[PDB]
């Protein structure tokens, strides 16, 4: 019985174990990182087989209370849409470890730690059903990718790429957060199933939808803000350029 939580925990265990060992034994670090990524990939494939495509309700749900009132909590869960994204994000990470396999002695253990943290965080984003906490993990990828781009990037313009990438995900992100708070105060919970079955005011949906689109028009390269992707993507490492 393989649940959704073990998939999330596997990169966490791989990262915690990797910090215990020192940096002198570089072969152990790369071997353990690749092994953790590959077992996470296999676990993701196993989750595919035991996926009911007939029902419309969500698959494995793990609820961990967050607020004392159980008002909002980690509500994990996959469906037809979120499953393939989980499989893809589990599949891409071992490739990321493998591309820079020769230069691992130059990068160090921070590189694999950052990539496994990214895998954990990206898995947590796709397979969760809490609107607010999904926002938390949605821009939680700022720190690890900022580190990846900045520490191992271009020659001298690496600083500017990090700043443009970090700046484009602030104003729209928090303008989305305002809508998140209005939704939370209006309805009462951020559970996705509850929020789907709610009568929103006709004039209210326009503002909330605009706020949501403002923070998604930056991640999806829309017309106003898409110049970050070329510059911040050329000024990025090859393994950081394959998940971006």
């Amino acid at each position: 019985y393989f649940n959704l939580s073990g998939l999330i925990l596997c990169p966490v265990l791989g990262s915690i174990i990797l910090l215990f060992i020192p940096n002198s034994r570089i072969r152990l670090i790369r071997l353990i990182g690749l092994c953790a990524s590959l077992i996470t990939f296999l676990y993701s494939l196993v989750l595919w087989i035991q996926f009911d495509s007939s029902t419309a309700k969500f698959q494995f749900v793990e609820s961990l209370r967050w607020l004392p009132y159980e008002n909002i909590n980690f509500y994990l869960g996959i469906d037809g849409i979120s499953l393939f994204f989980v499989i893809l994000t589990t599949f891409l990470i071992p490739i990321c470890i493998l591309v820079g396999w020769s230069g691992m002695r130059s990068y160090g253990k921070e590189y694999i730690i950052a990539f496994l943290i990214c895998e954990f965080l990206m898995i947590a984003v796709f397979c969760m059903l809490d609107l607010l906490l999904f926002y938390v993990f949605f821009e939680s990828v700022l720190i690890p990718m900022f580190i990846i781009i900045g520490v191992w990037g271009s020659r001298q313009r690496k600083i500017k790429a990090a700043y443009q990438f970090f700046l484009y995900t602030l104003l729209g992100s928090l303008f989305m957060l305002l809508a998140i708070l209005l939704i939370l105060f209006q309805t009462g919970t951020t559970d996705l199933q509850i929020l789907l079955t709610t009568e929103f005011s006709e004039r209210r949906q326009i503002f909330l939808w605009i706020a949501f689109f403002a923070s998604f028009a930056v991640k999806v390269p829309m017309v106003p803000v898409h110049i970050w992707l070329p510059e911040a993507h050329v000024e990025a490492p090859t393994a950081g350029s394959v998940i971006l």
């Binding site: 009911d52 029902t55 969500f58 749900v61 008002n71 079955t197």
Partner: protein, 85 residues
């Protein structure tokens, strides 16, 4: 036997009860909406309760002064005059 005759029922054991899933989904929706209404009611409480001073902890003087109104420095002038008899 052969591989598929075992992999079949292996996958069938791996998969879960959908009736349990549907029941849990409708349940979770029911209690989540009830708790949502409860929290909406709770957020409506004013910062200052209607009673406030009526509360026994917010008086602290109606049951302290009566046992002090006999000490020197707090007596009505017409208390020591007729207390002799």
């Amino acid at each position: 036997g052969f591989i598929m005759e075992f992999a079949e029922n292996l996958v069938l054991r791996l998969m879960e009860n959908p009736e349990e899933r549907d029941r849990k989904a409708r349940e979770h929706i029911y209690e989540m909406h009830e708790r949502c209404k409860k929290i909406k009611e709770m957020w409506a409480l004013p910062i200052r309760p209607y009673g406030f001073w009526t509360f026994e902890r917010h008086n602290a003087q109606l049951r302290w002064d009566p046992q002090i109104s006999q000490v020197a420095g707090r007596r009505d002038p017409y208390d020591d005059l007729l207390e002799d008899n």
